Amino acid sequence: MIPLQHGLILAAILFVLGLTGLVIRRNLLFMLIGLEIMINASALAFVVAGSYWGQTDGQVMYILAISLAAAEASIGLALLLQLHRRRQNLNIDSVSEMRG
Amino acid sequence: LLKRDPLNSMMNIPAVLSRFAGKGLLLSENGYLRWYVASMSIGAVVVLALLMVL
Amino acid sequence: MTITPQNLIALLPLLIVGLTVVVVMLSIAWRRNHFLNATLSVIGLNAALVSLWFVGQAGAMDVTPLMRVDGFAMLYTGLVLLASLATCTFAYPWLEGYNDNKDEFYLLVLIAALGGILLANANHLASLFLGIELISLPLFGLVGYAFRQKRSLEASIKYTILSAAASSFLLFGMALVYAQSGDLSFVALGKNLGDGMLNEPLLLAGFGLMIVGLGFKLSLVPFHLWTPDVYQGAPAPVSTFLATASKIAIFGVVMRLFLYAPVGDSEAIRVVLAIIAFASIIFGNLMALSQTNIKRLLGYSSISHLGYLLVALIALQTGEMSMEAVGVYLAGYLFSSLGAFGVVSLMSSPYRGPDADSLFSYRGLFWHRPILAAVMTVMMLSLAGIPMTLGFIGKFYVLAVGVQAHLWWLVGAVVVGSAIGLYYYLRVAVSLYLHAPEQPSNWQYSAGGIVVLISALLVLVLGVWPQPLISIVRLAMPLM
Amino acid sequence: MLLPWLILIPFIGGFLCWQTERFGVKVPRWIALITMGLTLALSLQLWLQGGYSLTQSAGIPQWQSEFDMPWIPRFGISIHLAIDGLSLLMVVLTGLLGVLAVLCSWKEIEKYQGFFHLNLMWILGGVIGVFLAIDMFLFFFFWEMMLVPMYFLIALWGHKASDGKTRITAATKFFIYTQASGLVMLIAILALVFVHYNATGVWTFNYEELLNTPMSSGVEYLLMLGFFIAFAVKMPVVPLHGWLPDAHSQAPTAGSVDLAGILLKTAAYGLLRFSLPLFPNASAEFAPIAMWLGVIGIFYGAWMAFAQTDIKRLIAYTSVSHMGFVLIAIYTGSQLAYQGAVIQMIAHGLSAAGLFILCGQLYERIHTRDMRMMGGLWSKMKWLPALSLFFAVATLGMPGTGNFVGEFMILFGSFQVVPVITVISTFGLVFASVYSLAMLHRAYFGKAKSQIASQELPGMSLRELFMILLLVVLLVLLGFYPQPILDTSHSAIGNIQQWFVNSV
Ligand SMILES: CCCCCCCCCCCCCCCCCC(=O)OC[C@H](COP(=O)(O)OCCN)OC(=O)CCCCCCCCCCCCCCCCC
Ligand SMILES: CCCCCCCCCCCCCCCCCC(=O)OC[C@H](COP(=O)(O)OCCN)OC(=O)CCCCCCCCCCCCCCCCC
Ligand SMILES: CCCCCCCCCCCCCCCCCC(=O)OC[C@H](COP(=O)(O)OCCN)OC(=O)CCCCCCCCCCCCCCCCC
Ligand SMILES: CCCCCCCCCCCCCCCCCCCC
């Protein structure tokens, strides 16, 4: 008696909020934060879908989603550390040299 | 009047159009990561809207 | 379900590449030896490639509720393994000039090849997602392997951010698809729909988000803007792997998804894919008109060739020879891209420091590297679809598949894009054979030269005589 | 049986010319010489043993010799060669032009002469394969394979006085035109094969099997349009013509390269062999469009040739006008017009080859091509201006040369079918005389308009003089006795015309 539509709507709201944070912020740290928000929203959507059908598949896909999320957070934060080490700023618009 | 070979230029018109279209399309490759994310989301909107319409 | 010993026999390349990952790991833990670790990696990849024969003698059936092993999976595993072996071969002379740790490169290549094998054998949305991540994350490491270099770090940041965004889009798409269908297997996507109600709104939305993620992964317009930057900034063997193996594996799993899912026959998805293929062909050819750099030119080339592949994929439900066309085209594209990116890698090796430019300068290459120039111009003719080359055979297959399914807009797109490709590919070839103002000695560099030479010979021989390739592709027939 | 060797002897000869370059720089020219000697001897032996004069018309297909060997059995694709009178005539002409091209490049002591001979040999083998193949995929394969060595010759061995950018631009324009047109032809071939497969159920690219294909009015028109776009690009037909003067201008300065592949003789053969028999109703419906395109081609090429300051461009536009005449002849359904088209095609090949050889010899004499920079060259040379006068007289359709004979049978048959286009074409003949006399007056008559033409010039060599006199003798014999040529191609022309008019 909790609708699947409401859970999917909540996950979609969090996904588009994470996408908005990923786009509008020039800071690479806030871009990684937005990426974490989007992948957590997708994992929440999988949990909602699995709970609607009464299957463990949603939680299995949640586990795979957070394994991916942890690994990409590690890789992105290492890249952010290298960028801050060799540029002393996190402005992602500064790294735009290759073009055309 | 014909010594400039007008039919040759008329058939070379697609080459000029291709050059202009390529130069116009290369403006999207500005190298900005935020624009790349914005273009991916714009394409997501376009694909979703096209699937909803059809 | 349970796993039989026959299932373990059918999973032989997966187990062999994973055991190679563990063995190379423990060998690096023992002692950092570049030659020994590279040798162990290529030995494991060759062992998987020759265990494909035991997989073929095993049969074609369902190893997991996740994997299905068939001739399609064998062909795509073979293409991925060949691309990974060529990546290691090009990578060794480039890594010979690398001052930091070199052994992690082959570990990342092995894990990416494992993801490619996963995508080749994938029959499940979970397997598709895990294979995409298992390909992409070693590519995150490899694209920015020379992270002290500014362009490589920039390409790594762009690829990591955009691929995490595409993975989130794809994951949300599978979440919506699972919410609709209730099963994550490929055969059960839209199976519960009936009476002409195949165009379910939530199922179409989930498939659209998955199309966004996969079209990022396949460099399709408008998720294509990352491709020339990431191709240029990455190391040249990494660009070889990213152009060949990632594209091949992701297109193979997309082919499986659209072949097995009953919603792959939807008219709306077909029209959306037609629009994406048209725009991809035209845009990828148009952006490469004025490209001086060879890596960005090859990136736009990858966009156009994946557009031709998408054109072949749209006619999957109409013609039964669409899988034949995709296999032949992918073999030809693999060999041509291997030759071109191997020429780039051999002229970019050894790595001449992070603070120096990695410009190619292909002008006048024949007067000091004649065999490399001959291979490179053979590859440029092959990517143009010019006869006596395997790329022409693939493009002929694409045109035949488009004609059989009456995709006339796509046929015209292929013709126009082929003309534009002719322009810039022949420009590269004559620039190779012009004159240059100004401007090895180990058996691994010679091995890379041998690899690109056999690639050129295969392109020419199968361009004038494609029937063995046709027969081996017809042997790669999946489950019905 | 000899057709695979007719194709393969140029390819093996080019490979031997490339590989035997290590024995010296004067070695590959001889190897190419016996290569084209063997090719021409095989062609003449097929001419003698074919019995073409005694051959009646038995309808398409009717091949004097045939060869079949499977190549891609999945699509029903085979190396399928066949020869009859028309194909044999064009193979003989191609072999003769290859002999003249080997003779014309005798004094080139370039560092990469072996690869030049390999490219020339592969172009000639591709042209012979175009003339011999009766498999649609094989015909398209030869039609596109004759372009890569042509591109590399124009781009890397080309007109050294002009910049490399101009040569690369001209070569790229020629390649893009020819390959895009060929891709449209390949689309038409694939659609025809798929329609035949839907109608019957057999995978076949064979020309004999695709003759009987039940096709709607509108699909046949589209397939004929694709074939005609390819042939019209390589005919040339206006407006798809400018690649030919740009390729002639930036061709290598020997003149052999002009005779090798830039001379147009395959597209009208493709129109007679494939466009009319495969699509007779569509060709009959398209005939007014093609005939008016031929009229426009004649007049436009004549006005283009008169308005040229470059002699090579003038000869190229002369070729454009003559090929417009041939295009008018093709879409008429008259046996007289078809035989005239064959004679005009052979005579245009001979006369254009002579004009291009003489222009090349003049260019190694005076090191320029501008007609404003030369004048009064009759008194400065020994043999060249008189032979150029004869070849300009030949190209304006003067009786005594085969050009007049071919174009007048063309006009006789055309007036038997269409009078108005015939009278406009004969005013095009007036225009042809106008531009031929204009080039003669601007080149060899008058006073010296510069300093390079003021002094005496060295005489022509004995070999160049001998091959030019061979061309002169062949043109005069074709004008005064075209009967062996008319008897050789009478059966094939009769079969094509009977198929065209008995199915409409
Ligand atoms: C810029 C260069 C590239 C140009 C664009 C690329 C080519 C575009 C081709 C457009 C074709 C449009 C076809 C329009 C009708 C389609 C629907 C239809 O009614 O099809 C009829 C028929 C299918 O119905 P069926 O029951 O099979 O009937 C058998 C017919 N004998 O259909 C068939 O049986 C097959 C029909 C095939 C039609 C011919 C296709 C190729 C024709 C040659 C190329 C296009 C024309 C020449 C170039 C134009 C200018 C560029
Ligand atoms: C009559 C109508 C019915 C029949 C239609 C038949 C169509 C097929 C046969 C005709 C093909 C025409 C091709 C026209 C372009 C030929 C190449 C050319 O002119 O290139 C010029 C130029 C390169 O030289 P340049 O000027 O030095 O430029 C250097 C720039 N840095 O080039 C460039 O700078 C860019 C070149 C880009 C590639 C060439 C353009 C391709 C466009 C699509 C071709 C397909 C046909 C489309 C429809 C044509 C009109 C009907
Ligand atoms: C007779 C009346 C009844 C009608 C019958 C049919 C028409 C007959 C008309 C005959 C007119 C002949 C005129 C010839 C003039 C030649 C002399 C001349 O003008 O010479 C100048 C120039 C010289 O040539 P060039 O080599 O450039 O010289 C270098 C320096 N001057 O030369 C040039 O620049 C070249 C000049 C070329 C002239 C071409 C004439 C074409 C005639 C077409 C006839 C069409 C008939 C039908 C008309 C429509 C009917 C409804
Ligand atoms: C059409 C399919 C491919 C055929 C082979 C393409 C070319 C491969 C390389 C062959 C060797 C090229 C040598 C060129 C020498 C140029 C010398 C120029 C001197 C000015």
Exposure b/e, C30-43, CB count within 10 A at least 16 = b? eeeebeebbbbbbe
Cβ(C248)–Cβ(C334) under 8 Å? Answer: yes
Backbone angles phi, psi at D381, to 5 degrees: -120, 170
**CA distance linking residue D90 with residue D74, whole number of Å:** 32
What residues in B contact C272, CB-CB < 8 Å? 47, 50-51, 54
Exposure of C23 by Cβ count < 10 A (0-12 exposed, 13-18 middle, 19+ buried)? middle
Q: Where are chain B's structural domains?
A: 1-53
Q: DSSP 3-state assignment of D310?
A: strand
- Whether cis (ω within 30° of 0) applies to the bond prior to C228 is no
Give how far the C-alpha of residue D265 lies from the chain's centroid of Cα atoms, to the nearest Å: 2
Residue corresponding to tokens 């006339």? C408
Cis omega (within 30 of 0) for bond into D239: yes
Distance C133 CA to ligand 4 centre (A): 42
Q: Where are the alpha helices (DSSP H) in C122-266?
A: 125-143, 150-181, 201-217, 227-233, 236-260
Spatial separation of the C-alpha atoms in residues D194 and D199, rounded to whole Å? 9
Using alpha carbons, list the distances in angstroms from residue A32 to A64, A85, B23, D211.
19, 17, 33, 65
Looking at residue D194, its amino acid is: F
- Contact yes or no for A19 and B41 at CB 8 A: yes
What's the CATH number of domain A4-94, 3.30.365.10, 1.10.287.3510, 2.40.30.10, 1.10.10.10? 1.10.287.3510
Tell me if D307 sits within 8 A of B2, measured CB to CB.
Answer: yes
Cβ(C63)–Cβ(C232) under 8 Å? no
Give per-residue burial for D482-494: e unless 16+ CB within 10 Å, then b: beebbebbbbbbb
- Asked if residue D202 lies in contact with residue D76, where contact means CB atoms within 8 angstroms, the answer is yes
Contact B7 D303 (CB under 8 A): no
What residues have CB less than 8 Å from A38, skipping those under 6 apart?
Answer: A14, A15, A18, A19, A22, C165, C168, C169, C172
Sort out which chain B residues have CB atoms less than 8 A from C268's CB and list them: 50-51, 54
CA C245 to CA C85: how far, in whole Å?
10
CA D387 – CA D403 distance, rounded (Å): 16
Q: Amino acid identity of D59?
A: G
- Which residues in chain A are closer than 8 Å to B31, comparing Cβ atoms? 96-100
Place of tokens 């560099």: C445
The residue count for chain D? 504
The residue among C119, C117, C131, C87 whose CA lies nearest residue C105 is: C87
The answer to whether residue B40 neighbours chain C at the CB level (below 8 Å) is yes
Write out residues with Cβ below 6 Å of ligand 3: D 427, 430, 434, 438, 441-442
Cα C88 from Cα C25, distance rounded (Å): 16
Helix axes D335-366, D462-480, angle to 10 degrees: 160
Q: Within 13 Å, how many C-alpha atoms sit on residue D250's CB side?
A: 25
Ligand 2: does its nearest atom lie under 6 Å from the Cβ of D355? Answer: no
| Resolution expressed in Å | 2.7
Contact C441, C305 (CB under 8 A): no
Q: How many domains does chain C have?
A: 1
Q: Which range marks the domain in which residue C155 is found?
A: 1-480
Q: How was this structure determined?
A: cryo-EM
Number of helices and strands in chain D (H, E)? 21, 2
Question: Under an 8 A CB cutoff, do B42 and C161 touch?
Answer: no
B3 CB-contact burial (10 Å; exposed 0-12 / middle 13-18 / buried 19+) = exposed
| Beta-bridge mates of residue C69 | C61
Q: Which of D438, D442, D355 is nearest to D390 (CA)?
A: D355
Residue nearest to ligand 1 atom 44, measured at CA: D226
Q: Are C327 and C395 in contact (CB under 8 A)?
A: no
Helix axes D462-480, D402-417, angle to 10 degrees: 40
Distance between CA atoms of residues D189 and D179, nearest Å: 15
C376 by Cβ neighbours in 10 Å (0-12 / 13-18 / 19+) ranks as buried
CA distance D385 to D391: 10
Residue C296 half-sphere exposure toward CB, CA atoms < 13 A: 19
Ramachandran region, residue C356 (left: φ > 0; alpha: ψ -120 to 50; beta: rest): beta
Helical ranges in D200-234 per DSSP H: 219-233
Say how many C-beta atoms besides its own lie within 10 A of residue D408's C-beta.
18
Do residues C411 and C325 touch, judged by C-beta distance below 8 A? no
Decide if D36 contacts D97 (C-beta within 8 A).
no
Q: How far is residue D393's CA from residue D351's CA, in Å, rounded to a whole number?
A: 10
B13 interfacial to chain D (CB closer than 8 Å): no
Place of tokens 């008329």: B10
In this complex, the residue of B26, B34, B41 whose CB is nearest that of residue A26 is: B34
- State if residue D216 touches ligand 1 by the CB under 6 angstroms criterion: yes
Residues of D in contact with B16 (CB under 8 A): none
Q: How far is D360 from chain C (nearest CA, A)?
A: 25
Q: After which residues is chain B broken (C to N over 2.5 A)?
A: none
Dist CA C123 CA C130 (whole Å): 12
CATH (one of 1.20.5.2700, 2.60.120.960, 1.20.120.160, 1.20.1640.10) for B1-53 = 1.20.5.2700
**Spatial separation of the C-alpha atoms in residues C185 and C127, rounded to whole Å:** 9
Dihedral class, residue C389 (left if φ above 0, else alpha if ψ from -120 to 50, else beta): beta
Cβ-defined contact of A23 to B37 (cutoff 8 Å): yes
DSSP of A85-100, one letter per residue? HHHS--BTTT------
Atom 35 of ligand 3: nearest residue by CA position: D434
Q: Is C202 on the interface with B (CB under 8 A)?
A: no
Q: Which of D241, D298, D299, D310 to mutate to test the interface with B (most CBs of B within 10 A)?
A: D241
The answer for residues whose C-beta is within 8 angstroms of residue D481's C-beta and 6 or more apart is: none
Closest of C187, C190, C217 to residue C202, by C-alpha: C190
Task: Scan residues 382-441 of C and list those with Cβ closer than 8 Å to D.
Answer: 386-388, 396, 399-400, 403-404, 411, 415, 418-419, 422-423, 426-427, 430, 433-434
Q: What are phi and psi of D65, to 5 degrees?
A: -145, 150
Ligand 1 centroid to Cα of residue D74, in Å, is: 24
Of D345, D97, D353, which is closest to residue D248 (Cα–Cα)? D353
Contacts with B, D 234-263, CB within 8 Å? 238-242, 245
